[PDB]
Design a binder for these strands. Structure first.
Lengths: 50, 139, 134, 117, 129, 52
RNA sequence: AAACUUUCAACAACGGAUCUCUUGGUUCUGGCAUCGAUGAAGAACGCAGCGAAAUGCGAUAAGUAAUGUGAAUUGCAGAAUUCCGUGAAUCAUCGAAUCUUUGAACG
RNA sequence: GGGACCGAGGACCGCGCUCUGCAAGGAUGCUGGCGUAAUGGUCACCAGCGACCCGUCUUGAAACACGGACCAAGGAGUCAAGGUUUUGCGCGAGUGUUUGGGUGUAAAACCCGCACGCGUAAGGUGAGAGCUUCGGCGCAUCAUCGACC
RNA sequence: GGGCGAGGCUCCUUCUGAGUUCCCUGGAACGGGACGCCACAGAGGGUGAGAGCCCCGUAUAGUUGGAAGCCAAGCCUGUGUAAAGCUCCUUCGACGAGUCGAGUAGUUUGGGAAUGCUGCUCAAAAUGGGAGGUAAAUUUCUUCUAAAGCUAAAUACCGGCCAGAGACCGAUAGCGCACAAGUAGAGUGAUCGAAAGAUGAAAAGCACUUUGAAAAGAGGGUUAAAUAGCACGUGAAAUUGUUGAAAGGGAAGCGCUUGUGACCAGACUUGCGCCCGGCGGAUCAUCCGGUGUUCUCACCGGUGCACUCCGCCGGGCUCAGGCCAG
């Protein structure tokens, strides 16, 4: 499993090392994102009517 | 894996933050783009191996991707500044692009980009005075 | 960012309240900053303008003109500094409306009420300065 | 199926999240008044009537007087210590009596009862 | 069809891979797989574990099972034999049941690497009706 | 980062999706020894000389 | 050739489109429960130094008392405020008053 | 032998011939004037030839009939519910969080305990895509003989 | 069991961060550049043009005074053979009438076992009455108690007192009404019912002179602007005046192609490369060390102090260069 380095408050590596949490290997599907994002952005709207 | 140059092109072919679209053609503002044209050949950020040339104070500044540091942006660019003669800059850039199998297709494009930057750094000739014609000349 | 539900971010309501404010509210809106010497003397940043004060204009066509306040015209959100005037066609001089935000108070008209005003602002400023300090 | 004047009787639930916040605040108000007490009342376990649902149990309205006496809880004190009482329900079987008596003894084990004054 | 109706990026890569294979090989296997990647979902019915188990009963064992569809699970099958199945998609239960038996699950791009010409392959389709 | 494994292990009725392709690098697949050994000889070039 | 008719251009007219703006509308959500014989809602007439309307008030009449703030109002004219003060203000708040003719309207 | 119109392509590759080469898979070579309104373009006009006023409606078709003084702005297949077909997406013998409850940076986003809606609880022969160790194996589907309820 | 009750919660109310630092344009910086600061506050608004730090406010914790409700640590007391919960039993145990119900008429419901209601005729019962289950052998069994009454909460809300918002409309739109709009006005009356926003940052709303009876005009002036003068931001078209050009023997307008006249956009101005000469400068080749990488390619520093390398200038030559042609 790949790993990722941890950085401190000064920007230098601290020697700590963590494992990539398995969600960054998920398929990248922009078509799913567009479909899901389109609906989720509509869920904030307020009604308008004459 | 799930991520490759082919995938990034598919995700980013139709829209990018670097994309400039007009009626006469499509350009790209990518710093690792030698011809500033939108294509898989020339999309530097898409490709694992790519080149880019930017002007310096005198000469050219060539940046190449490091394949073993794709996930470390601060240490992902191999940067060389060429401030010697133009011919020596062309020799290094072309060898940088073709002598080891690092984008030999970009050899001609890279040398041309270096030439344009060096030409653009040359002093500018003063333009000739404008000449009026016909009705404008008679008034 | 606004948090309290009683606060409103509406442009329509803010402009309505500002232009329809009563005289007492307009006095607060017509405040002016205090000079640097007065800041280190009273530990006070700003104070509502009034008639007796002496101000120095720091914004507008009147670059660095000094004078005493003559009128606080709260109906149009302007003050009248002395000798800051323009002549009409007839040659009669009329005052030029200067906004309090464009001036700085150099000398302060002092009375028991305004010493109370300055003391209350100082009390809050020193309270949080020590609260933040320790 | 719009043969009547449906347009004048159409209810839109645009206050669904607003009413939820109102309901959550009302529950918080009860906890504010009854600070250590729970905001609900203990309710018995009952069996659904129909043969379709008789294999499943749920919560009833209140405890029967017989099963309240078997637990050892007086009638007049039960509504006062947070127990619902139903004078209409009958036991009719030892199974319902035992289940709710055991429920009451479990409630008594977890109870903290303060002195009156 | 020239461009698939789907917006899946990975499906486009599969089409591009098999378009190259169909042009540069004489295997009719690659042309069938390419043409099935183009068609719609209703034209790609699911293939169940029961149906694939039937079709390798006689002598088609130790072969590669290829369906351009989704592979589903069937509760009627009690025992699942070891098999080599390559498909567009697998369900969570069907994939687990195949792996529990001892078989292996492949994608269509892995099939291209292992069997670029469809050698020793059993190609099936789901019930249209 | 540590919690990111736990949050996706707790979503009910959801597992991390399985992609329809295993390798996304087309250049590696096409230019592999397995594919190239079984290909036919090329039938032409990118640009063809026009005869007449 | 001019005049007249027509076309275009510049300038100028007629008219108020376009752009820009908005103390307005419209829709949704939240907290709360408060008209009247102790005379309501509505109608009328009066009241300002200079006011027709709108607005405010009722012969104490563009208002009185009390509380707070703290130096105005302003279109003009006239008074202020001593500012080291029960105190300006077409100020805000508001628990006390005045409150013409009618109107459920009641000699 | 005398005219006219045209010069598409852009390293090589070919067919060939009369081979130090060529008229053979598409124009080169030499020269002159000018280098600016000169070519070219836009307007207005004259000239030669050409050319019914739009729309609607009726009809096989015309014709009649109706609308048209001019300009600016506005101006007409939308929303909701219920069915249904096709495309994309998710999960798939299951699927649907959003009545409701729990968090929240508060009408968003995140999470889900119990019900509930819709659906679900094995042959012979001939063709036949595709594999083949060349002996054969045979998807889907159709035809026929079946088997079961 | 009664009476005080510190104090507390809710709501109003006082106060609480940081640039008006330098330069440029500008009538005016709130714009551009530079150098800073605050931030539990970079929501919003104003200030002469896009302001976190000029001003009001904004955020969090406090802090000043007040209002009315409710809670409440504690402190005084209590009282009368006073009230209350249960347990047991050789004693008792009252439960709603012109109301159910039957008949009939109208109406109503998905509901003639009348689904409910109402009117009329008759008019009850007490191991009673109502409803339901059931072929199960008789109408067994189940479940309630009508004709008296009270009660918060979850639910509705185009109205009342406010408050917060919007992928809404932007003055023929949005409510009829952004304005002294249910107004002006019409009708005997019930009722009907409009049009109508914008000078400028600031009136600084043109002193004064002159012509005119005056309305106004012209100078002069304010302003960044009067190409902003209250017939006031910007100011299209229809329609009209003047000036400039042109055409016109009973229509004009439209298509193709020249010509005339007026008016114009391009293109070009030279680049490249060789051979000499005058230079001005050491990023010439090589080698050494360090570093970076694509592990063999580079870059820095040194050596290389001149038939090598880089830029300029003065000549010669080649090639490529615009338009129309032979």
């Amino acid at each position: 499993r790949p790993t990722v380095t941890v950085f401190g408050a000064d920007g230098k590596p601290t020697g700590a090392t963590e494992v990539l949490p398995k969600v960054f290997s998920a398929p990248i599907r922009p078509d799913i994102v567009k479909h899901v994002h389109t609906g989720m952005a509509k869920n904030k709207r307020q009604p308008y009517a004459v | 894996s799930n991520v490759s140059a082919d995938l990034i092109w598919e995700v980013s072919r139709n829209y990018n933050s670097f994309l400039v679209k007009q009626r006469t053609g499509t350009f790209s503002r990518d710093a690792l783009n030698l011809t500033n044209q939108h294509s898989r050949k020339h999309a530097g950020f898409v490709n694992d191996k790519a080149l880019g040339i930017v002007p310096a104070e005198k000469g050219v500044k060539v940046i190449a991707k490091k394949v073993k540091a794709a996930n470390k942006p601060a240490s992902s660019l191999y940067t060389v500044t060429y401030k010697s003669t133009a011919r020596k800059a062309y020799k290094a850039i072309a060898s940088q692009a073709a002598k080891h199998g690092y984008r030999a297709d970009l050899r001609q494009a890279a040398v041309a980009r270096a030439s344009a930057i060096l030409r653009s750094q040359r002093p500018v000739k003063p333009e000739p005075p404008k000449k009026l014609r016909g009705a404008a000349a008679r008034r | 960012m606004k948090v309290r539900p009683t606060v409103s971010s509406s442009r329509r309501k803010a402009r309505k309240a500002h232009f329809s404010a009563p005289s007492s509210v307009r006095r607060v809106i017509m405040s002016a900053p205090l000079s640097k010497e007065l800041r280190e003397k009273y530990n006070v940043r700003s104070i509502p303008i009034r008639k007796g004060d002496e101000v120095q204009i720091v914004r507008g066509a009147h670059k660095d003109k000094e004078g005493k306040v003559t009128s606080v015209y709260r109906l149009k959100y302007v003050i009248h500094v002395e000798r800051v005037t323009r002549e009409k066609a007839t040659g009669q001089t009329v005052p030029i409306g200067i906004h309090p935000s464009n001036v700085v108070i150099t000398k302060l008209h002092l009375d028991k009420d305004r010493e109370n005003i300055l003391a209350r602002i100082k009390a809050g400023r020193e309270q949080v300065a020590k609260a933040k300090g320790k | 199926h719009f043969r009547k004047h449906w347009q004048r009787r159409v209810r839109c639930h645009f206050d669904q999240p607003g009413k939820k916040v109102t309901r959550r605040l009302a529950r918080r108000a009860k906890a504010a008044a009854l600070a250590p007490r729970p905001v609900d009342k203990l309710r018995p376990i009952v069996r659904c009537p129909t043969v379709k649902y008789n294999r499943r149990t749920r919560l009833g309205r209140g405890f029967t007087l017989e099963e309240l006496k078997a637990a050892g809880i007086p009638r007049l004190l039960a509504p006062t210590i947070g127990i619902a009482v139903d004078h209409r329900r009958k036991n009719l079987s030892e199974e319902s009596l035992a289940a709710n008596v055991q429920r009451l003894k479990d409630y008594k084990a977890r109870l903290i009862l303060f002195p009156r004054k | 069809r020239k461009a698939p109706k789907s917006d899946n990026v990975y499906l486009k890569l599969l089409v591009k891979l098999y378009r190259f294979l169909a042009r540069r090989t004489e295997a009719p296997f690659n042309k069938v797989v390419l043409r099935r990647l183009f068609m719609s979902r209703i034209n790609r019915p699911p293939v169940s574990l029961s149906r694939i188990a039937r079709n390798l009963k006689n002598g088609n064992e130790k072969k590669t099972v290829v369906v351009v569809a989704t592979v589903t699970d069937d509760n009627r099958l009690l025992q699942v034999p070891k098999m080599e199945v390559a498909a567009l998609r697998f369900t969570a239960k069907a994939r687990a049941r195949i792996e529990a038996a001892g078989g292996r699950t492949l994608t269509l791009d892995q099939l291209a690497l292992e069997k670029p010409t469809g050698a020793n392959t059993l190609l099936l389709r789901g019930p249209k009706n | 980062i540590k919690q990111l494994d736990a949050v996706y292990e707790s979503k009910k009725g959801f597992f991390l999706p399985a992609n329809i392709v295993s390798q996304a690098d087309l250049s590696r697949l096409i230019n592999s020894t397995e594919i190239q050994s079984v290909l036919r000889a090329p039938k032409g070039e990118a640009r063809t000389k026009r005869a007449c």
